[PDB]
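Our collaborator T.R. sent over the components below with a one-line note: 'Predict the complex.' Nothing else. No constraints on interfaces, no templates requested, no preferences about which chain binds where. So this is a plain run: every listed entity goes in together, and whatever single assembly comes back becomes the starting point for the next discussion.
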Amino acid sequence: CVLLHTSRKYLKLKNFKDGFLAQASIVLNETATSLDNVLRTMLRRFADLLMAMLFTDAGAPMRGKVHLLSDTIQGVTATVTGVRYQQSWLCIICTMKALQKRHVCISRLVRPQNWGENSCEVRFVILVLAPTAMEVARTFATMFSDIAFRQKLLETRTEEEFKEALVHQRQLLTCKDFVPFGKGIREDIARRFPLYPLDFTDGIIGKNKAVGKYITTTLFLYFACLLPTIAFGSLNDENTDGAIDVQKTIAGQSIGGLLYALFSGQPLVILLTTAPLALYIQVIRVICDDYDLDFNSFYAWTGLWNSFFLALYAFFNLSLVMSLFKRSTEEIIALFISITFVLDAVKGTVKIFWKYYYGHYSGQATAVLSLLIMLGTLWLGYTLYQFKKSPYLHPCVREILSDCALPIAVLAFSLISSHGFREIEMSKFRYNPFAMAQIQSLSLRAVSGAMGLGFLLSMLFFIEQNLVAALVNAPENRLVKGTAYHWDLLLLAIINTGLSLFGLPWIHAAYPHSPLHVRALALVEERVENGHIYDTIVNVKETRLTSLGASVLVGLSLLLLPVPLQWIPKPVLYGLFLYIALTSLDGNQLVQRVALLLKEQTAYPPTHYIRRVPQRKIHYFTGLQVLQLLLLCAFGMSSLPYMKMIFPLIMIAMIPIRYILLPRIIEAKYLDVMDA
Amino acid sequence: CVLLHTSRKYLKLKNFKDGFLAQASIVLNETATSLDNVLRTMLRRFADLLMAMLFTDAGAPMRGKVHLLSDTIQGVTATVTGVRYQQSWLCIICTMKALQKRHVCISRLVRPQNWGENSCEVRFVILVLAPTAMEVARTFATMFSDIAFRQKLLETRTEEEFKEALVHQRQLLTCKDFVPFGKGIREDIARRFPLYPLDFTDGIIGKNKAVGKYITTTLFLYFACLLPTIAFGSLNDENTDGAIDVQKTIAGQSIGGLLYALFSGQPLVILLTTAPLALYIQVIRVICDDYDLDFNSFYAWTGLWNSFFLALYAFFNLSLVMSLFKRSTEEIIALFISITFVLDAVKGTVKIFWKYYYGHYSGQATAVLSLLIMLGTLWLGYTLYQFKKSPYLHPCVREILSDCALPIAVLAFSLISSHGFREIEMSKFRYNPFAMAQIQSLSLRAVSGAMGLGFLLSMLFFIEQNLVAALVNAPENRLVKGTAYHWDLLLLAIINTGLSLFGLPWIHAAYPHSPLHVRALALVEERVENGHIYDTIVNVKETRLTSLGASVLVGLSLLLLPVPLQWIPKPVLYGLFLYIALTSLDGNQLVQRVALLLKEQTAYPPTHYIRRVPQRKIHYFTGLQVLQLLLLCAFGMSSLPYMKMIFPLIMIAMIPIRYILLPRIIEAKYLDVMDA
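Returned assembly:
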């Protein structure tokens, strides 16, 4: 072995408040795969024994030794996760006494190439030869450290355009809030009204064409909204004894998505039915059965009261308090939703076994095949989804696999269970081939009960919709257009009134699908941390065409319901539920901290928040979060409808708990470190 | 973000051909988890505002910035895989003008702690403060760069012992080969005879006690030899129409393992039946059925001829030519073995479906449950095995998971399929509760045929045994005791004669279990490359107690045949075959190159052999290897016994092909880079 001396030092960003800009040599579309070839081409561009000195193996270039660059500059940032390097660019420096004049070469690679640790996705290489080099390297790093400038340089097609862009960039671098009634809605409408044409003409016309990306994301959204829509329709049909069918769920989802895409601010939010909504509909069905009330009328009245409360919240600008919402409560809610998905799948398979395996109406074969198909669908979907994080696959391959993991698994296992195992008939969701509910035919006592239930549902809707909207409107997503929280809530209430009046299932912003929609509709910079791909969004196109097309396709899918879309057996839908439950915990810090018990604290990056905070306080915070999650499960997943209807109240209550009690029992600094 | 300047430079290993050795301060068993605490303790040991200067965030220690060490020294080596850092130690340097005298502090951590990017498993921290620092840091790095010296320092218990060890280490650092008949056997016996007591008294007595490690590895070996032994016994019973039972396979494996452990050199090699051996036994059964020859007599004669040829090879010292063996041929053979395992599992499940699902004697339920159990066993075993590579799990946790993955999966799914699904009876391996074969009652023509078949089997045995022995005797394993190839081959021939005379299935060195046995019986230094744990063996204990105990336990397991060990259904054994097939390709470079078509070449480390070699030549080599593998599969996996009996010949032929033809069509430099 050979000893290596690594020296790290800061460099102040150049303060612009040039000759080498014009004298720089630009290489575009470099197809070389190795560092040696790229550097040889870059050096030849100047006009060789000069490439050898660039690395540590200076003096013994023939013998096989460690081949590492000597002087490099990169962008670095500090975060709770650790030290994140800007791996999209690299600046190599070489001070050669033989040379007489400074030389600068900027090379843009066709594809991102690993160029070392913390440079796994280099696309720009800035080689600076000096006869100092420090000043030129610092100024070029300062110019290249901008996230948008790198994308602008990527968009350039010619060397002259590259130099002009560089010159242009250098020159350029040189309480009581709720008192106003309806202020938030008016502000959101004013913000997002003038941008409507823009929203509809972002990628269709202009310098950048997004037709292919728009089509691909439209297909993604259509599939990822239809398949969960079918699963939720089947679940509701099982829960409501056929009151809400799969056809009703599909129609409601299509209408709601179309209305939201057409007439909402922040169109990137996707409306879909959720597991807690199914649980609450089950609560309504149980209450109606107990009190002999018509399901349709009671459901319509509950939806009407929920929409009324949501409109009251929107008009009074309550959404602002959602700024106090922290990540811990969000992750607790997400884990509860995943647990509800898992329990729905388990209940479905248990019912299948009870009806078929135990003969409580060849049933054993059907039950075993159902279990096998559900587990296999889950496994295949999870594997195809996790292939997205592989840093060695082509970007196209690992974005198609992410895009078409669940659809591929569903199709493959539907074929397996309907053609490979056609001799074993199994369960399929009901389909009997939209009348307004008789709201007037209901007692006043039932109206008051619906009022209370709608209040609880409105709290649930407020929390969920604002959570997903905040996720979509995160600062790291780089959304130029303004936010629309109150107008979005009002439109959600309106469309929910419309859906409830016709008995269609409720819908709100979908947590798993909205960030996925944003990512599919965004340009990202690949980052490799611990052998996994992480995406840094640079530009989101922010168009309504994708959501509108997805909604229209989902609506048109009603014609494929009888003959197609029914060969998908119920176990495939349960596997879809399991896949959603597992894949909704990708960035869950609560799950990470829970697993930390089985992991090693000292194995995390030196600057990771886990290592920074004492393990005792981390465990205390995890225990408090787990206690909150257990209490949420206890109320919101019991057999008692009267106590299953209360879980929105405790969802509201956790926010005051996190805001008040936890800082009193846990130090504020540690909570700030963990949450951020 | 803040620009970072990384400077890399060589440092010549100190040439010893001291005061600071005695003046150094030693800290032992440091339980601190963060860098700040460790460095604070180390600085306090001298007797604070000095810890801040050690990192790049000098001048702004309060504001949250990137917290990286400034001057660090590490051990680095170059390999075809890439640049491998010595992550077990780190030397931090700080030149402070305030200080008046040099200071050195050596801290040993209780557990390996990530301390960087290429410092994921640091256990020794050498902090050098200077008022130069370069000389002291270089000499300490040179002393610590030794792999065995780090283990010796770990073994020390007190500061005085640590200093004495440091001082002692510093002082210390200051053709025609086959003509002799039987020379190899005599040399091996002379080498390995005096070390017998040592072999039996390595960890039992002395400074280091290995009782716990010996017990754990004995349990691992027992389970990993019994379960595949049962699977192979069932496969042979299916193939040979009950001629070779599971009881016979267990007895033969136990006797052979005991004999090999007792009276062989290099006892770390594990003898077990293999898939090609099962295929060849099937060939023998088919030939006997075709020619109406007694299976036992023909099998015994074939084994006798195979042993005679193996003894001839051992006495004439042919094993030496195995040095010409390359990694490409080894990996082709391993992939062929895995494919044979997969086809055996597929044939078993196809037969189960044909008998039960199609009723060609509730069968559909049994077939579907068989498929589900096999797939689930494969999945669980693979997951528990792959958890071994997680860099965040505790070393004990991942070591146990690797040790008890297959046994845990087998037990869990046997319980599931025998208790959870007890209503669905399914296939179980035959067991009817050891007579010498009537060799004298066989025709001369059958004797000549058995001679030819035994010649082919002897070539197969030579290749397989020498391959596994070379894997066990790899230089990187650090085996102090000498190698024994010819004596091992002679003993293998003797025990094979003994086994064949009684009709027991043949056995030779097991490729998947011998390296695993070595690893379980070895101390390793953890390395994290691309987020995966890689082990560097420092010391292998090299004892026969583990293999002897495993063989004795396997033999004693015959008493657990009737009531235990039969609830394991055949699909569990097929899942075991699949698990072995998938887990035998961990380091397969042929599989890596085949998958490279779907991967990105530029995403590999800069110094990886994949990027160094042009992709065209990599693809040509992969295509040639795949063609050889396809020919091997075609000959050794067809329905014709006369052509299924020839695959050992082409296994032999592939070595001349690799040695002669490939260098002619592919450049020698690229082949050397890829193979090494």
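Summary for T.R.: Chain A has 26 helices and ten strands.
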